[PDB]
Amino acid sequence: GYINVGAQLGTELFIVRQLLQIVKQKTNQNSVDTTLKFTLSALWNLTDESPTTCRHFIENQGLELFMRVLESFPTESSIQQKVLGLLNNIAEVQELHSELMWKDFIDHISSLLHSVEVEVSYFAAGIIAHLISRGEQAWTLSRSQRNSLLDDLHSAILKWPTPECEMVAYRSFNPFFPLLGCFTTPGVQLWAVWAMQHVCSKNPSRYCSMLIEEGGLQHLYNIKDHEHTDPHVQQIAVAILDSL
Amino acid sequence: GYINVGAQLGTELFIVRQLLQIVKQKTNQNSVDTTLKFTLSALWNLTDESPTTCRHFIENQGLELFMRVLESFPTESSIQQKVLGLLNNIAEVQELHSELMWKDFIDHISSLLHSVEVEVSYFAAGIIAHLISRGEQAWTLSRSQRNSLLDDLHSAILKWPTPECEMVAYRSFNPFFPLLGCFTTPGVQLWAVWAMQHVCSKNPSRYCSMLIEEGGLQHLYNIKDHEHTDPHVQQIAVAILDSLEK
Numbered sequence: 001g002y003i004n005v006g007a008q009l010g011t012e013l014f015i016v017r018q019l020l021q022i023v024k025q026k027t028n029q030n031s032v033d034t035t036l037k038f039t040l041s042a043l044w045n046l047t048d049e050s051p052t053t054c055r056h057f058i059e060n061q062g063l064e065l066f067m068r069v070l071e072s073f074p075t076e077s078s079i080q081q082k083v084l085g086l087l088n089n090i091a092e093v094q095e096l097h098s099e100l101m102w103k104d105f106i107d108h109i110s111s112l113l114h115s116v117e118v119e120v121s122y123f124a125a126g127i128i129a130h131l132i133s134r135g136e137q138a139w140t141l142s143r144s145q146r147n148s149l150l151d152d153l154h155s156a157i158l159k160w161p162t163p164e165c166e167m168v169a170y171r172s173f174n175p176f177f178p179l180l181g182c183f184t185t186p187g188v189q190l191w192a193v194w195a196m197q198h199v200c201s202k203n204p205s206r207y208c209s210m211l212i213e214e215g216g217l218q219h220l221y222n223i224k225d226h227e228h229t230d231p232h233v234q235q236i237a238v239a240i241l242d243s244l
Numbered sequence: 245g246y247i248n249v250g251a252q253l254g255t256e257l258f259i260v261r262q263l264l265q266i267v268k269q270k271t272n273q274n275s276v277d278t279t280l281k282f283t284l285s286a287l288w289n290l291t292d293e294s295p296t297t298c299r300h301f302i303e304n305q306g307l308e309l310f311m312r313v314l315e316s317f318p319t320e321s322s323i324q325q326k327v328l329g330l331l332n333n334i335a336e337v338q339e340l341h342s343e344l345m346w347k348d349f350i351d352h353i354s355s356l357l358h359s360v361e362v363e364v365s366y367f368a369a370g371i372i373a374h375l376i377s378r379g380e381q382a383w384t385l386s387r388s389q390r391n392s393l394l395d396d397l398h399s400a401i402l403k404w405p406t407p408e409c410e411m412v413a414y415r416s417f418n419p420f421f422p423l424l425g426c427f428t429t430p431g432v433q434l435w436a437v438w439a440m441q442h443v444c445s446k447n448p449s450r451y452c453s454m455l456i457e458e459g460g461l462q463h464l465y466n467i468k469d470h471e472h473t474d475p476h477v478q479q480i481a482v483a484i485l486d487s488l489e490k
Contacts, residue, residue, distance in 0.1 A: 048246040
């Protein structure tokens with residue numbers, strides 16, 4: 001039994017609200033506890049493929065709470081991966097795009113995009129890739145930054161070694177397929193195919209089939225035979241292809 | 245994206261721990277507020293048809309804390325309803341039966357059975373009907389208390405007025421069906437049939453179809469033909485029968 005029809009949703013957004021509180025007290029205490037990392041992980045996981053959870057996160061001042069954990073724990077890369085991992089999930093939500101066009105934010109993840117630790121800059125890239133993928137009209141901050149970041153995206157990826165373990169898990173590749181078509185912005189394209197290549201080669205049982213069943217092959221073959229394609233994007237896309 | 249495959253179980257049992265802590269903190273400040281009430285509601289909903297959550301609750305000192313909740317707010321009937329609704333979900337998980345064989349726990353539930361609020365009494369009854377259902381074998385507490393609870397369970401159900409609104413929600417009637425076959429212990433069936441009639445009465449669009457789909461009719465049709473049946477248990481049988489018969 002449960003309390004009333006339609007009440008499970010309110011319970012989940014309440015849980016979000018309480019987790020964010022635990023984040024706010026751990027940050028006031030400057031206390032990098034296991035409870036705090038458990039909490040950032042819970043938030044991260046609850047925003048996976050949940051625009052509703054993501055919008056609740058934004059409306060409870062989450063974006064500013066998290067800019068503040070990034071500034072309070074500058075040397076904590078585990079904390080930085082979970083923060084940015086969630087912000088990557090937010091970045092996937094189109095209607096939340098304007099909410100992320102804040103300058104203290106872009107400027108911060110833009111710093112993290114140049115972290116040499118792929119477990120941190122992979123998600124900073126994901127955020128940026130998703131935002132740029134809208135671009136033109138949608139970019140309401142420094143048009144020089146968008147054009148700058150588009151090059152920093154493309155070049156940070158080239159430097160990335162392959163990760164030790166899996167840094168991330170996906171239930172679906174659908175949020176990547178819009179990126180795959182962004183020929184005019186090759187770093188956007190390059191993060192998506194790099195992302196796909198990474199998870200497929202670490203755990204092909206789960207992901208190679210997922211990739212094929214959601215039509216990913218179509219998109220990858222589409223990059224390949226659209227031969228006016230960035231060569232680094234072509235490189236990875238044909239490497240994902242000849243592996244299936 | 246999310247942290248790693250199969251990690252939603254660790255995060256949700258972490259949630260159960262953090263909610264229990266908020267209960268502990270609100271109880272400690274005598275703060276009966278929206279946070280406390282949301283947190284009880286959250287624990288209630290999270291234990292719905294979820295033996296892992298029920299077990300994590302018991303393994304993280306849930307039972308002790310919730311009785312400390314009943315003892316701290318003895319007139320807060322909204323708190324009591326939520327507390328007893330969770331404990332009713334736990335009373336459904338047979339693996340957990342023994343963990344609820346604590347006389348101090350049962351004393352609380354027996355006492356709340358006599359509440360003048362059906363919204364509170366209904367859930368004490370539910371914990372009791374399920375526990376008496378497990379059979380005199382699994383009842384590691386007194387037999388003189390097990391039987392008196394059956395007389396009280398049965399006589400309480402017949403005192404209850406029609407509640408104003410739906411008191412509870414369910415996704416499946418399955419946990420009730422074993423209760424329907426307790427011809428030995430009538431008040432246990434009476435809770436089951438009263439509860440089904442309550443939700444069909446208040447929300448037939450939802451429950452009249454759910455009850456039929458899950459094979460509830462044959463369980464009721466068992467009660468209509470078995471002639472050595474409790475009369476009150478039998479009359480609710482037929483009234484639900486005809487109501488479901490559209």
